[PDB]
Each structure stands twice: as structure tokens, then as C-alpha cells.
Amino acid sequence: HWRYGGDPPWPRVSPACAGRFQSPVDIRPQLAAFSPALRPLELLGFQLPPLPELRLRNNGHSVQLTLPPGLEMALGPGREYRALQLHLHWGAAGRPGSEHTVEGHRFPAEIHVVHLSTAFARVDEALGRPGGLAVLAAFLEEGPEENSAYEQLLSRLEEIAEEGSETQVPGLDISALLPSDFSRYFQYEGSLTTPPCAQGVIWTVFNQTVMLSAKQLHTLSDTLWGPGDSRLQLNFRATQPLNGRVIEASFP
Amino acid sequence: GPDQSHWRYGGDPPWPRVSPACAGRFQSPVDIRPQLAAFSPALRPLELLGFQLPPLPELRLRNNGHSVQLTLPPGLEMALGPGREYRALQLHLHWGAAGRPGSEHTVEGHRFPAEIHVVHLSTAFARVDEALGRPGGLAVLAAFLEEGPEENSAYEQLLSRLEEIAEEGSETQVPGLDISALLPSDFSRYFQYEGSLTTPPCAQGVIWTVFNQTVMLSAKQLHTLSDTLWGPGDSRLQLNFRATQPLNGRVIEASFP
Numbered sequence: 414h415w416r417y418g419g420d421p422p423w424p425r426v427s428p429a430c431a432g433r434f435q436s437p438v439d440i441r442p443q444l445a446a447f448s449p450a451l452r453p454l455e456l457l458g459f460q461l462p463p464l465p466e467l468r469l470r471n472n473g474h475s476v477q478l479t480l481p482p483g484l485e486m487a488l489g490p491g492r493e494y495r496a497l498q499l500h501l502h503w504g505a506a507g508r509p510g511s512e513h514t515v516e517g518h519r520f521p522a523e524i525h526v527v528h529l530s531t532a533f534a535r536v537d538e539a540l541g542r543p544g545g546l547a548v549l550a551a552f553l554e555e556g557p558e559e560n561s562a563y564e565q566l567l568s569r570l571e572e573i574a575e576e577g578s579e580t581q582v583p584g585l586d587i588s589a590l591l592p593s594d595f596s597r598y599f600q601y602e603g604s605l606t607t608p609p610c611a612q613g614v615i616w617t618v619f620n621q622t623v624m625l626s627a628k629q630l631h632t633l634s635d636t637l638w639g640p641g642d643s644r645l646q647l648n649f650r651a652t653q654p655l656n657g658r659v660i661e662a663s664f665p
Numbered sequence: 666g667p668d669q670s671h672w673r674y675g676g677d678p679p680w681p682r683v684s685p686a687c688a689g690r691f692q693s694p695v696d697i698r699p700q701l702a703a704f705s706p707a708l709r710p711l712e713l714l715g716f717q718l719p720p721l722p723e724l725r726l727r728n729n730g731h732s733v734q735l736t737l738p739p740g741l742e743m744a745l746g747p748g749r750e751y752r753a754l755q756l757h758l759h760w761g762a763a764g765r766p767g768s769e770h771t772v773e774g775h776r777f778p779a780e781i782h783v784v785h786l787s788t789a790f791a792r793v794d795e796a797l798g799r800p801g802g803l804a805v806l807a808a809f810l811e812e813g814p815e816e817n818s819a820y821e822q823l824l825s826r827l828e829e830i831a832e833e834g835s836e837t838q839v840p841g842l843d844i845s846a847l848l849p850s851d852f853s854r855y856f857q858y859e860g861s862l863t864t865p866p867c868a869q870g871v872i873w874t875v876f877n878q879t880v881m882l883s884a885k886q887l888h889t890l891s892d893t894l895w896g897p898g899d900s901r902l903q904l905n906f907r908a909t910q911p912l913n914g915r916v917i918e919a920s921f922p
């Protein structure tokens with residue numbers, strides 16, 4: 414089974430991991446193309462009630478929250494998706510762990526909300542297909558104030574410390590885990606950041622970040638156990654070259 | 666319902682009965698207002714390779730009653746951008762009648778004499794039926810045909826064969842030709858937006874790329890195109906285009922400032 418920082422080589426696990434257009438990438442704001450056609454993102458049905466509960470799992474490469482049907486998202490007019498799950502990427506003590514970087518800067522952590530195009534019934538049908546999968550990514554930065562939205566997830570990590578364990582958590586407002594402005598973001602086409610690394614994924618990276626306390630960031634990157642009786646840390650992929658791709662910005 | 670595959674221009678069955686998608690909110694064609702198009706510097710020049718076909722093998726040219734369609738062979742590769750590849754499947758035309766333009770798309774309300782469409786299939790899909798309705802599954806390149814003083818050599822290869830397939834359902838084999846010669850000169854100037862097929866099933870998720878520059882045909886050639894073929898029933902195959910559809914919020918992008 415694949416892992417971070419070691420065999421098996423990802424290209425052996427999946428040929429697509431050696432594709433020419435992979436993710437994540439380094440975003441250089443000055444080189445991003447202002448595209449007036451990029452409208453504000455629309456997310457409805459993300460304010461979930463206390464029940465039913467949601468599955469939170471330590472799968473060895475991240476902590477993943479399974480999302481229910483009904484979380485509708487649109488990248489634009491007639492381009493709709495539904496959220497499937499969200500997970501995080503982080504570093505370690507004294508080391509940032511976001512996947513994407515901005516002007517070479519790596520942030521403490523990054524959250525990914527994976528969506529499936531309504532044109533596909535299942536994920537296996539969308540893999541590798543243009544726009545079949547769309548991921549919303551936001552950077553998590555260190556701040557003086559503790560984040561209430563993230564407290565709902567971070568306080569449950571200890572319950573699933575051991576690799577492969579899972580637990581049910583109360584419903585929460587998923588949209589509260591995201592930045593304040595849905596009209597400011599970068600967008601480009603790439604791939605999944607972990608095997609099978611299928612291409613054709615539409616990546617949308619919020620320009621605004623969300624803040625977590627130093628303590629919360631410590632809890633996120635030093636609680637779960639990964640493969641090989643070792644703390645699950647630095648679970649992010651190195652940035653990949655744009656190789657000609659042009660990143661678009663929804664703002665001038 | 667019975668005979669679900671049947672449809673025509675200018676009359677029953679209502680397209681929504683043929684295919685529900687024909688009543689979708691985001692259809693094609695649309696009216697293009699250059700002033701309101703969003704300049705998107707990420708739109709690079711179109712790439713078309715393998716379009717210069719040799720004399721043999723021959724290609725099938727058919728009057729399907731809705732248009733004259735040329736079946737393209739494997740090998741015509743096209744890219745809308747890096748890593749966004751397609752292969753051409755076929756090309757067809759939309760035209761008007763005596764003293765009446767018939768293009769599908771319009772620019773600032775202006776309708777051109779005719780329009781050519783080169784339909785492509787994303788390399789991520791093995792078959793068309795899997796691409797239908799999927800985002801970017803199908804991509805169509807569209808160019809306007811205008812009236813000019815000179816006879817167009819490229820189009821002569823198609824127009825001179827229409828008499829052999831005047832009746833709906835007729836077909837003939839024609840010599841290989843340079844498909845790219847049927848297109849405009851600048852592949853870097855175009856408009857692009859997402860819509861649907863302009864005929865049933867009217868599946869959405871189609872990426873439309875409309876060249877900013879046009880190609881010219883003589884008045885005689887345009888007359889040959891609109892006055893030689895016969896359509897469904899006993900009517901002349903003319904005015905085979907769909908009315909303009911509202912953008913409904915969609916923003917057309919332009920590859921040039």
C-alpha cells in the first residue's frame with residue numbers, strides 16, 4: 414500500500430502519478446490569469462443538523478470525514494457537484510504541511526473537500542475524466558484565537574489515534590470550516606495528490622485562509638498514528654511543475 | 666416513446682419530447698456579444714494535428730436529412746489546452762436559403778451565411794455515448810462561412826459532391842482532403858463557452874469554441890450548399906439551424922483582448 418516518504422514508488426502503484434499535469438503546485442499570484450468568468454462559488458446544504466452523525470476515520474494517510482448526500486456545490490452556471498468527503502494535510506513540529514504553496518510559501522496545513530460532478534453516478538466513473546472531480550482547498554494558518562469549527566474535528570482525533578480506527582461525530586456546519594470570501598480563489602486543472610493521481614481534477618484554492626490556534630495545529634499534526642507505529646505527519650505531496658498550465662484568479 | 670430517434674427542424678415532434686435535455690437551461694447556440702466576452706489569457710492557441718489527410722483511404726460523406734456529414738478517421742488530434750486532448754469524429758454544416766443566412770451562432774445579433782462544425786471526443790472517453798452529458802466530454806470547433814469573391818478550393822471538394830447525395834439517406838465515398846484547410850487562418854483568436862449539442866439529444870457539457878476569423882465561399886458556392894440537398898419528407902434541406910438560446914448567466918470567454 415502506498416505511503417508518504419517511501420516505497421512503493423507511486424508510478425508503480427498508478428501510472429497516472431507520473432503524468433505531466435499533477436497537483437499540488439506552487440501558486441504565483443502575479444502569474445495567475447485574471448479570469449472575469451470565474452463567479453463566486455455556491456455551496457448549499459452544508460449546514461448539517463446535529464443528527465445523523467458522520468463517520469470520522471484515520472485511514473493512515475489522513476483523517477477523513479464522510480459527508481452525506483445533499484451538499485450541493487457549483488463552480489459556475491450549470492456546473493454542479495456534490496461533496497463526498499473532506500480530509501486534511503499537515504506537517505510536524507516546526508514544519509508546515511500544506512500541499513499547495515503560494516510564492517514558495519508552505520502553510521501549516523490544508524483542508525480538502527472532494528466533490529463529484531452530478532454527471533457521474535460514482536467516483537470510479539469520474540476518475541481521469543475532465544472535471545469529473547472537483548476539490549476545494551483552503552490553507553490553515555496559525556492564529557491567536559482558537560477555531561470553533563475545527564474544534565469539532567480536532568477534539569475527536571484522540572478517539573481515532575490508532576491507524577484504521579473510526580468514530581461517529583455529531584453533525585456540524587461544514588461551510589464554517591471554509592474561508593470568508595467565496596469569490597476570491599485560484600483555479601487550475603490537475604490531479605489527485607495521492608495515488609491513483611488521476612488527472613482531470615478541477616482544483617479551486619481559496620485566496621483567504623482560516624486560522625487555528627498554535628495548540629490546535631499541534632493537535633492536528635501530533636495525535637494520529639500512521640503506518641509503521643509512527644505519528645502520521647508530513648502527509649503532503651511535493652509541489653508539481655505547472656508544465657505550461659496557467660493558473661486562473663477570480664480576482665484582479 | 667416510439668421512434669425516439671426521429672426529429673426535424675421546423676416542426677413536430679417537440680424537441681423536449683425527443684430528449685428532455687433540449688429544454689435545459691444552458692443550451693447552444695448563443696448570440697456572442699464581443700463587448701461582454703471575458704478576456705481570458707489562459708486560453709492558448711488551438712492545436713490540430715493529423716488533419717492533413719492523404720488521397721486514400723476515402724471518407725464517407727452523407728446526407729442524413731439534417732445536414733451533410735463527413736465521417737473523419739482516427740488520428741485527428743486536437744487540444745484545447747495542455748493535457749486537454751480530443752480526437753475529431755465528424756464535421757457537418759448549418760446553412761440558410763436564398764437571401765437568408767443560416768449559421769447557428771450569431772455575433773452581436775448578426776447571422777452569417779453558414780457555419781461549419783467539427784465534433785470532437787475527449788480522449789478520456791472511449792465512446793460518444795459515455796461522453797454525452799459529461800463536462801467537456803465533447804468539444805465542437807465552429808467557424809462562420811461568409812460570402813466572398815473567390816471560390817474556396819477546400820469547400821469545393823464537399824460542395825461538388827452534394828448532387829450525388831441529394832436525397833436524404835444517400836451517401837458517397839469522397840477522396841481524402843486536408844480537413845484543416847476548411848478552417849480559419851488564426852487558431853489563437855476565438856470565443857469559448859460551455860453549452861449543449863444544437864440538435865437532439867441536446868446533451869449539455871459541450872465545450873464550444875467559435876473562431877473569431879471566418880472563411881469565405883463564393884456566392885455560387887453558398888447557393889450550391891443551400892439549394893442542392895433534400896431533407897425530411899419532401900422539403901429542401903435549408904435553414905437547418907436552431908434559434909439562439911439565452912446565455913442565462915454563462916459568460917463567454919475570449920482568447921484575445
Ligand SMILES: *[C@@H]1O[C@H](CO)[C@@H](O[C@@H]2O[C@H](CO)[C@@H](O[C@@H]3O[C@H](CO[C@H]4O[C@H](CO)[C@@H](O)[C@H](O)[C@@H]4O)[C@@H](O)[C@H](O[C@H]4O[C@H](CO)[C@@H](O)[C@H](O)[C@@H]4O)[C@@H]3O)[C@H](O)[C@H]2NC(C)=O)[C@H](O)[C@H]1NC(C)=O
Pocket residue numbers: 442443515516552619620621622
Ligand atoms: C491572495 O492573493 C493576493 C493578491 O494577488 C496575494 O498577495 C500578493 O502576493 C504576491 C506574492 O507573494 C506579492 O508580491 C510580492 O510583492 C513585493 C512588492 O513589495 C514591495 O517591493 C516593490 C519593489 O521591489 C515595490 O514596488 C512595492 O510597492 C512594495 O513596496 C515584491 O518584493 C515580491 O517580489 C520579490 O520576492 C520574490 C520571491 O519572494 C522574487 O521572485 C522577486 O524577484 C522579488 O525579489 C513579490 O512580487 C504581492 O505584493 C501581494 N499582493 C497584495 C495586494 O497583497 C496573496 O499572497 C494570496 N494569498 C493566498 C493565501 O492565496
Ligand SMILES: *[C@@H]1O[C@H](CO)[C@@H](O[C@@H]2O[C@H](CO)[C@@H](O[C@@H]3O[C@H](CO[C@H]4O[C@H](CO)[C@@H](O)[C@H](O)[C@@H]4O)[C@@H](O)[C@H](O[C@H]4O[C@H](CO)[C@@H](O)[C@H](O)[C@@H]4O)[C@@H]3O)[C@H](O)[C@H]2NC(C)=O)[C@H](O)[C@H]1NC(C)=O
Pocket residue numbers: 699700772773809876877878879
Ligand atoms: C471578432 O472579434 C472582434 C473584436 O471584438 C469583433 O469586432 C467587434 O465587434 C463589435 C460588435 O459587432 C463592435 O462593437 C460595436 O462598436 C461600435 C463602435 O463604433 C463607433 O461608435 C462609437 C459610438 O458609441 C464610437 O465611440 C466608436 O469610436 C466608433 O466610431 C458601437 O457603435 C456598437 O454598439 C452599438 O451598436 C450595437 C448594434 O450593432 C448595439 O447592440 C449597441 O447597444 C450599440 O447601440 C458596438 O459596440 C466592435 O467595434 C468590433 N471591434 C473591432 C476591433 O472591430 C468581431 O465582430 C468578431 N467577429 C467574429 C466573426 O467573431
Ligand SMILES: CC(=O)Nc1nnc(S(N)(=O)=O)s1
Pocket residue numbers: 525527536548604605606607608
Ligand atoms: C476518491 C477520492 O476522494 N480520492 C482522493 N485521493 N486523493 C485526493 S486529494 N488529496 O487530491 O484530495 S481525493
Ligand SMILES: CC(=O)Nc1nnc(S(N)(=O)=O)s1
Pocket residue numbers: 782784793805861862863864865866
Ligand atoms: C453525436 C454527435 O456528434 N451529435 C451531434 N448532434 N449535434 C451536434 S452539433 N450540431 O451541436 O454539432 S453533434
Ligand SMILES: [Zn+2]
Pocket residue numbers: 500501502525606
Ligand atoms: Zn487531499
Ligand SMILES: [Zn+2]
Pocket residue numbers: 757758759782863
Ligand atoms: Zn452542428
